[PDB]
Design a protein around this ligand. Structure first.
Ligand SMILES: Cn1ccnc1[C@@H](c1ccccc1)N1C[C@@H](C(N)=O)CC1=O
Ligand SMILES: [Zn+2]
Length: 139
């Protein structure tokens, strides 16, 4: 679990959004596993606007933050789960690291701020949904 809190927006994994997030929907994309809802209180996270390929992510199943090298946002196949049928997820970035079901929502950050959140795992890999192209989050 986990979310990004920027301005009056809450960014979460779409598959973990609550029925309350849907009532306060701003934007969602099933192909990106992202959902953004509106908030009453102002958040303090800053979104990175960069092309960094190194950062640090939080892994809740280890209670540890790991430094990783991660790939460019791309269209990557994701096997079927209880949340989605087998499909290509877009804007996804992979790193070599630990990620289990329960780890989605962990933040990946570089020197410029928040890059994305954990969205995929297994096989000694971790996948992050990129948010650096969502410029409207800043206004
Ligand atoms: C199904 N699958 C393939 C690779 N990873 C997963 C699992 C998964 C997520 C996180 C850690 C460990 C496994 N995901 C990915 C999520 C998605 N974005 O579609 C939904 C889901 O259950
Ligand atoms: Zn950066």
């Amino acid at each position: 679990s986990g979310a990004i809190y920027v301005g009056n927006y809450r960014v979460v994994n779409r598959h973990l959004a609550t029925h309350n997030d849907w009532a306060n929907l701003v934007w969602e994309d099933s192909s990106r596993d992202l959902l953004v809802s509106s908030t009453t209180a102002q958040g303090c996270d800053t979104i990175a606007r960069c092309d960094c390929q190194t950062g640090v992510y939080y892994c809740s199943s280890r209670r540890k933050h790991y430094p990783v090298s991660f790939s460019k946002p791309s269209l990557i196949f994701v096997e079927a789960s209880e949340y989605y049928p087998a499909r290509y997820q877009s804007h996804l970035m992979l790193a070599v690291g630990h990620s289990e079901p329960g780890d989605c929502g962990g933040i990946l950050r570089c020197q410029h701020g928040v890059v994305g959140i954990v969205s995929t795992g297994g096989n000694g890999l971790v996948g992050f949904a990129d948010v650096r192209d969502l410029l409207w989050l800043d206004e």
